[PDB]
Design a protein around this ligand. Sequence first.
Ligand SMILES: Nc1nc2c(ncn2[C@@H]2O[C@@H]3COP(=O)(O)O[C@H]4[C@@H](O)[C@H](n5cnc6c(=O)[nH]c(N)nc65)O[C@@H]4COP(=O)(O)O[C@H]3[C@H]2O)c(=O)[nH]1
Ligand SMILES: [Mg+2]
Ligand SMILES: [Mg+2]
Ligand SMILES: [Mg+2]
Length: 256
Amino acid sequence: ASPSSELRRALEANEFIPYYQPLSPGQGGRWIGVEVLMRWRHPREGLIRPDLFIPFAERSGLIVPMTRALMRQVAEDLGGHAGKLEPGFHIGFNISATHCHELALVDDCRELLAAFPPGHITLVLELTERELIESSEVTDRLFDELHALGVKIAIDDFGTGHSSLAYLRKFQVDCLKIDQSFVARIGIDTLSGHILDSIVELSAKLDLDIVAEGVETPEQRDYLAARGVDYLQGYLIGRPMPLESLLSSLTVQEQQ
Ligand SMILES: Nc1nc2c(ncn2[C@@H]2O[C@@H]3COP(=O)(O)O[C@H]4[C@@H](O)[C@H](n5cnc6c(=O)[nH]c(N)nc65)O[C@@H]4COP(=O)(O)O[C@H]3[C@H]2O)c(=O)[nH]1
Ligand SMILES: [Mg+2]
Ligand SMILES: [Mg+2]
Ligand SMILES: [Mg+2]
């Protein structure tokens, strides 16, 4: 057996599929977006989560084609249900570092946005703070074109890496996403009370939006709301879910 072969097989069989984790406002209300999370519906093993296959996919050279397939499926899934999404609804994708050195990303973003009415969604690209993009004239160009499309850049896993204020201006960052490890420490450890505050301060200084991830408890939610966190994501709000479940919930909220 070849793992690379098997990934190419899975991709050709459209086995990489999107799950959707909702984002809600800091002060509560109806959902304001989703993060798209890849899953592998494997014929024999069931639904495999991405920490089990994305690293291999990155090594193999297949992550870009896999991401493109995911963005195309999301357009197919949600592009015909714009009426269920309040204008400005965020749709976020995790982008691998290789994809950021490829001007093709601009075309993939354009294509996704074309599946919805103009300005109706906000496309967000999430770049992990753990792997800081090495800038070049290509990245300069790419991020300028993405910004001109109206795409937003989020830095996720935030607080776990070592980005600088200069890097945040360089890649035109719109949003920080606080890693779930910091949220998990609310009401338990002082140091991360300080780390979490320090991220909030950085975001107010640079006028960035903040999403807090891993929000599992009301304690956590209230703590984050009291510090002006814009958006919350976590099992308290909603686990990642298949399309049918997302549509069911959106219909309910559309109704209220
Ligand atoms: N226990 C707990 N977990 C929570 C909570 N809130 C969110 N999570 C989980 O944390 C992960 C959030 O995405 P991430 O930090 O980008 O971390 C992601 C991301 O780095 C990567 N990944 C997922 N989808 C893609 C993709 O489309 N492309 C690429 N390149 N990477 C992806 O896989 C990682 C893991 O994804 P998932 O397994 O879907 O796991 C998701 C989500 O289900 C919570 O309250 N409690
Ligand atoms: Mg994704
Ligand atoms: Mg993410
Ligand atoms: Mg994270």
